[PDB]
Point group: D2
Chain length 124, copies 4
């Protein structure tokens, strides 16, 4: 993938969370996520996909991933998806928006889903 | 997983798209997505995660998945993530919200991301 | 406004909430909202804007409005915005997505905002 | 309103857009918006609402507003809603997420709505 080497590695967001990812040649993202906030401790499995053949016109590389917030320690009965783009270079970034859905009853489903935004960098 | 059997199989949304998924015992979702709309043809790889040990209080099962819109036919330089919950029973559903990010220049990144909602059923 | 007469009046969503609105000739929306769910009772002031000169090509009419969830009875320290389009005709609809933000501390601001979707009709 | 004086005035976001607002004693927001990007020129009317009696526990003040992108110069057949919170003090901010809906045909309504996030400050 064009940005396989750029994406692969450890990333940090503005909350102090850690995103460890391997980008595969056929568009796969695999790794682990550790949130600094919320009903979470230690690492969670993540999986996702990226554009392995992005535009050559200076555009970012589209990607997304999912974490279900269950591991051996805790289960928050919730999943987050991040959708965004990798922007390579000296100060590389992944700029994302996310959707965090919890399991609800039907009566409470209107209130099932948080939205927010995370910016990941290779330092901090 | 509690809902492994319920989630696994073929799903259809209100647009006429087809979602084919296998739920794994350790929380994995793998399969293929075919959109009835947009800059897409044929099937795309998807991966994601679900809560394999949901609450037993009548709540839904939280899940999410990603599709990067590149296959052997087309590349839309974009990725969609779906975040939502599975609601089992006679008229099973997956109720989702989604984020579709395209690769953009920095100047156009404000306009990188669509949001919407899909409801999947086992018929239609 | 082209759709002034179509928008003006009483609307109901899938939750059983009631949206009472007057569309003005210069693009204003004014009225009251009563939620069937959440930390809400009775009516709340709403204000917003619509496109008073929409495209004549069969497109919908873009609009949005805000409710801050404070009235004489309760204060939920939160605001919802609805963004969507009016689609006129025998089975008129307003199709919306919404953002509901509560006041939070800085440490909890990641979790400040719910997202969802409401469909309003002139019956039910 | 507790934060009437803090909110009232001129605000700037990270795109270079300008938000001019008056906060009323009964929760109203009125003013004008000028976007630095997109299909927009000069000022547009905005209206919205804020929590005029926020929590006294260090939480932000919830608010939202709408702009329909029609003025005497241009009509983008679209509306944006911002939902967020005011955080007062030496480096006051309004932290928002937004939904921008354009009028579409029914076939294209899946793609009607952009999502993003704006941070407003009293300088820049
Ligand atoms: O806490 C979790 C798991 C960890 C999420 C951390 C997120 S992922 C996005 C962001 N980026 C990060 O690095 N960390 C955070 N899920 C429960 C979320 N709950 C609310 C919540 C709110 C405040 C504090 C703790 N929890 C319950 C709930 C879900 C849905 C709707 C309404 N309510
Ligand atoms: O079309 C695609 C790939 C297929 C997406 C189909 C979606 S996924 C969610 C929904 N559920 C489905 O089953 N199908 C659809 N990506 C380009 C999206 N573009 C816009 C678009 C708008 C209208 C028609 C076609 N394309 C460019 C663009 C992306 C971001 C921001 C702004 N603009
Ligand atoms: O309840 C309210 C006011 C009424 C909102 C009703 C909404 S508006 C959209 C939808 N359409 C309708 O007709 N009714 C509903 N605000 C507090 C929301 N809270 C959560 C909540 C969740 C479940 C039940 C009650 N409250 C606290 C909170 C806000 C943000 C983030 C995280 N958490
Ligand atoms: O451009 C406008 C009006 C101005 C919006 C400026 C926004 S408001 C949020 C953000 N904050 C700001 O200060 N400025 C920006 N509406 C058309 C948006 N269009 C896309 C667009 C994309 C790139 C460049 C210009 N336009 C068409 C369209 C709407 C919906 C879905 C899919 N596509």
């Amino acid at each position: 993938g064009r940005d396989e080497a750029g994406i692969t590695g450890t990333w940090y967001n503005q909350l102090g969370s850690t995103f460890i990812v391997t980008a595969g040649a056929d568009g796969a993202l695999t790794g682990t996520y550790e949130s600094a906030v919320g009903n979470a401790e230690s690492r969670y499995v993540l999986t996702g996909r990226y554009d392995s053949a992005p535009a050559t016109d200076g555009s970012g590389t589209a990607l997304g991933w999912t974490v279900a917030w269950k591991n051996n320690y805790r289960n928050a009965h919730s999943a987050t998806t991040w959708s965004g783009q990798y922007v390579g270079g000296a100060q590389a970034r992944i700029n994302t928006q996310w959707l965090l859905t919890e399991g609800t009853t039907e009566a409470n489903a209107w209130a099932s889903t948080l939205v927010g935004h995370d910016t990941f960098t290779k330092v901090k």
